[PDB]
Structures are given as structure tokens and as C-alpha cells.
Enzyme design. Structure first.
Site, PDB file in Angstrom:
ATOM      1  N   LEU A  83      -9.287  -0.936   4.295  1.00 40.98           N
ATOM      2  CA  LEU A  83      -9.933  -0.313   3.961  1.00 40.98           C
ATOM      3  C   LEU A  83      -9.727   0.549   2.741  1.00 40.98           C
ATOM      4  O   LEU A  83      -8.212   0.153   2.345  1.00 40.98           O
ATOM      5  CB  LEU A  83     -10.463   1.047   4.909  1.00 40.98           C
ATOM      6  CG  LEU A  83     -11.073   0.397   6.075  1.00 40.98           C
ATOM      7  CD1 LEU A  83     -10.344   0.445   7.516  1.00 40.98           C
ATOM      8  CD2 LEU A  83     -12.251   1.828   6.383  1.00 40.98           C
TER       9      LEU A  83
ATOM     10  N   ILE B 215       1.057  -1.054  -0.078  1.00 41.94           N
ATOM     11  CA  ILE B 215      -0.136  -0.152   0.284  1.00 41.94           C
ATOM     12  C   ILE B 215       0.924   1.212  -0.006  1.00 41.94           C
ATOM     13  O   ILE B 215       0.883   1.720  -1.052  1.00 41.94           O
ATOM     14  CB  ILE B 215      -1.419  -0.396   1.415  1.00 41.94           C
ATOM     15  CG1 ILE B 215      -1.826  -1.443   1.760  1.00 41.94           C
ATOM     16  CG2 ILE B 215      -1.819   1.246   1.370  1.00 41.94           C
ATOM     17  CD1 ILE B 215      -2.116  -1.477   0.119  1.00 41.94           C
TER      18      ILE B 215
ATOM     19  N   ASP C 282      -7.742   5.594   1.365  1.00 51.63           N
ATOM     20  CA  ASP C 282      -7.898   7.104   2.637  1.00 51.63           C
ATOM     21  C   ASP C 282      -8.366   8.942   2.715  1.00 51.63           C
ATOM     22  O   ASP C 282      -8.760   8.394   1.270  1.00 51.63           O
ATOM     23  CB  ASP C 282      -6.361   7.094   3.079  1.00 51.63           C
ATOM     24  CG  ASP C 282      -5.379   7.693   1.447  1.00 51.63           C
ATOM     25  OD1 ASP C 282      -5.501   8.806   1.354  1.00 51.63           O
ATOM     26  OD2 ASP C 282      -3.808   7.563   2.267  1.00 51.63           O
TER      27      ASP C 282
ATOM     28  N   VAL D  49       3.517  -0.678   4.968  1.00 55.05           N
ATOM     29  CA  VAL D  49       2.371  -1.380   4.688  1.00 55.05           C
ATOM     30  C   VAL D  49       1.692  -2.069   3.717  1.00 55.05           C
ATOM     31  O   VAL D  49       1.706  -1.831   2.210  1.00 55.05           O
ATOM     32  CB  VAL D  49       0.898  -0.352   4.724  1.00 55.05           C
ATOM     33  CG1 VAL D  49      -0.818  -0.966   4.755  1.00 55.05           C
ATOM     34  CG2 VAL D  49       1.140   0.667   6.290  1.00 55.05           C
TER      35      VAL D  49
ATOM     36  N   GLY E 276       4.353   3.325   6.340  1.00 56.52           N
ATOM     37  CA  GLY E 276       3.593   3.832   7.057  1.00 56.52           C
ATOM     38  C   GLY E 276       4.372   4.765   7.835  1.00 56.52           C
ATOM     39  O   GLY E 276       5.183   4.983   7.990  1.00 56.52           O
TER      40      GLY E 276
ATOM     41  N   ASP F 142      -1.676  12.043  16.580  1.00 58.73           N
ATOM     42  CA  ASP F 142      -1.342  12.222  14.964  1.00 58.73           C
ATOM     43  C   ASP F 142      -2.255  12.010  14.177  1.00 58.73           C
ATOM     44  O   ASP F 142      -2.105  11.508  13.242  1.00 58.73           O
ATOM     45  CB  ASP F 142      -0.252  11.705  15.347  1.00 58.73           C
ATOM     46  CG  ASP F 142       1.117  12.054  13.564  1.00 58.73           C
ATOM     47  OD1 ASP F 142       1.233  13.468  12.994  1.00 58.73           O
ATOM     48  OD2 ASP F 142       1.885  10.884  12.940  1.00 58.73           O
TER      49      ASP F 142
ATOM     50  N   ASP G 190      -4.303   4.328  12.984  1.00 62.12           N
ATOM     51  CA  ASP G 190      -3.493   4.771  13.638  1.00 62.12           C
ATOM     52  C   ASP G 190      -3.201   4.759  15.445  1.00 62.12           C
ATOM     53  O   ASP G 190      -2.563   5.817  16.037  1.00 62.12           O
ATOM     54  CB  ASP G 190      -1.927   5.202  13.241  1.00 62.12           C
ATOM     55  CG  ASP G 190      -1.740   4.283  11.792  1.00 62.12           C
ATOM     56  OD1 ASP G 190      -1.945   3.616  11.674  1.00 62.12           O
ATOM     57  OD2 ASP G 190      -0.586   5.342  11.192  1.00 62.12           O
TER      58      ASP G 190
END
Length: 279
Positions: free
Chosen positions: A75, A10, A78, A18, A13, A119, A137
Site C-alpha cells: 500500500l 520503506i 500509512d 520493511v 517495522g 497494537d 500487523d
């Protein structure tokens, strides 16, 4: 671990790479984060209990020779990518309102369990085709590059900041969905701080009792005047502007809580529309 088939990367991160994976056993499609100290171990173990429909589910934790893997529900997109996708046309207010409402519910849940995120940013906000948005996260900071969403108390040296930092961050993201431009795109800690100062005005003892006593506070900070809030998030209505100003209050103790924000008139007509994602 060999129970996983890496489908694809992906991206990078904050705490590691990821990968989209498939549980060779259960066949489930998941998100594998390749992140160790025993304190971080109990800390993320506690995170497994922190379940809410607006928090990305931590399915499993796998520790093996300094290697730490966090298995999360997957998912498809983002908020950062979704915002760019709808930049020319803008994300409809009902979807903006729905997203903010859900994130506040999630935050309210975490904050009720004395868990801060610390964050928040568009990349850790994950959405699905069904209209849901979740926080990713959560708790990882307490456990283990962008300053745009950083609360001012953090920037001024406060070592024991509160849940109010997440409210500040979400407020910045809220403004960004509305205007389609980052609120305070700082490119250094001082630039971030002064960007906030130029917009919300340089804080003093009047608006923020005890600000001048903060560690990184310098009497030499230039004194900027607070800008008319209607110039900050046009054309957000009065309710949204009211809520946003409350989420961006300098004094962390006066800043609106997630729980209280959920009661704001802004959400009186909140609905749950679905986004149109091109997967």
C-alpha cells in the site's frame, strides 16, 4: 527469497525492516517484512487464512535459517503520514467516518475469528488512492514503542485482555483524526495511565467493577475527575462523541464491540470518499 528484488527500504517495522520488493517472477510489487520458534510458525500460517478487504493481505511466508520473511500486499501510504499531510487543514469528516467504518468492519471480522491485533496505531493503518484503509500487523503480537493507543486494562496488568483493547486503540485514533493531536501521548506506562486518568477520570469500583483488584492498580493512584467530553474532541458532533465515549469505556466488558459500533447512528450517513495522495 532470491525471487525478490528489493526496490527500496520503506522503514523499520515493529518486528523488523520493511522493504518494497518486486517479485522477479510474477513482477508483482509487494511489501517484504524481514522478521524461528515453531509456535510463531503455525500462528502466522493461520494468519494467511484471515482474509478481509480491510486487512493487509499476507501473500506468503518464507522461512529460511532463522530468517523469517512475510510477503504482504503493498500500500502506498500509512495513516500517520497522511494525518501529518492533512494536519493544517484536517482530514474531512466524511473521510474520517469512512476510515473508521472500514477499520471497524475489519476489526469485526478479526474479532469474530478470535484474533486480536493488540497494537493498533496510525503507522499500521495503510491507505490507497481508492479510499480504502487496511489493518497491518494483525496477529503478529500474539505470534511474537508507542503506548499512546494502549488500553488501560493492559496498563493495569490484565494478562488475559480481550478484543476490547483494539476498540480502545481505534477510539484513540478516531479522536486523533478529529482533533489532529494524539489523545493520550504518554511517554511512560505511568504517564500513559495518568493521562487517561486525567481525561476520563480515575476509575473506581463504580465505573469499573474489579478495577482496584487489577495487578498494577495502586490505592495511591491520584483521583482525577472525568473531564467534560465536549472539551476532549471538539468539534465532533454528538453522534461521534457518543460513539467515541462508548469506545473509551473503562470496563472492557462494557466497551462497545466492533460489530455493535457499526450499527451506531454515527454511520447512518457514511460514504466512501477518496483521499488525495501525492505519491
Amino acid at each position: 527469497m532470491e525471487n525478490f528484488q528489493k526496490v527500496e527500504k520503506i522503514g523499520e517495522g515493529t518486528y523488523g525492516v520493511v522493504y518494497k520488493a518486486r517479485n522477479k517472477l510474477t513482477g508483482e510489487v509487494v511489501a517484504l517484512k524481514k522478521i524461528v520458534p515453531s509456535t510463531a510458525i503455525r500462528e502466522i500460517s493461520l494468519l494467511k487464512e484471515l482474509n478481509h478487504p480491510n486487512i493487509v493481505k499476507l501473500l506468503d511466508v518464507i522461512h529460511t535459517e532463522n530468517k523469517l520473511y512475510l510477503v504482504f500486499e503493498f500500500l502506498h501510504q500509512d495513516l500517520k503520514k497522511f494525518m501529518d499531510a492533512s494536519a493544517l487543514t484536517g482530514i474531512p469528516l466524511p473521510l474520517i467516518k469512512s476510515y473508521l467504518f472500514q477499520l471497524l468492519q475489519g476489526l469485526a471480522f478479526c474479532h469474530s475469528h478470535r484474533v486480536l491485533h493488540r497494537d493498533l496505531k496510525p503507522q499500521n493503518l495503510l491507505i490507497n488512492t481508492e479510499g480504502a484503509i487496511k489493518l497491518a500487523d494483525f496477529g503478529l503480537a500474539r505470534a511474537f514503542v508507542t503506548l499512546w493507543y494502549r488500553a488501560p486494562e493492559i496498563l493495569l496488568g490484565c494478562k488475559y485482555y480481550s478484543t476490547a483493547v483494539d476498540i480502545w486503540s481505534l477510539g484513540c485514533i478516531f479522536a486523533e483524526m478529529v482533533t489532529r493531536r494524539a489523545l493520550f501521548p504518554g511517554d511512560s506506562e505511568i504517564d500513559q495511565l495518568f493521562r487517561i486518568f486525567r481525561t476520563l477520570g480515575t476509575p473506581d469500583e463504580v465505573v469499573w467493577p474489579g478495577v482496584t483488584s487489577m495487578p498494577d492498580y495502586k490505592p495511591s493512584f491520584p483521583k482525577w475527575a472525568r473531564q467534560d467530553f465536549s472539551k476532549v474532541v471538539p468539534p465532533l458532533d454528538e453522534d461521534g462523541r457518543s460513539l467515541l465515549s462508548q469506545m473509551l469505556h473503562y470496563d472492557p466488558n462494557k466497551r462497545i464491540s466492533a460489530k455493535a459500533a457499526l450499527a451506531h447512528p454515527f454511520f447512518q450517513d457514511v460514504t466512501k470518499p477518496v483521499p488525495h495522495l501525492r505519491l
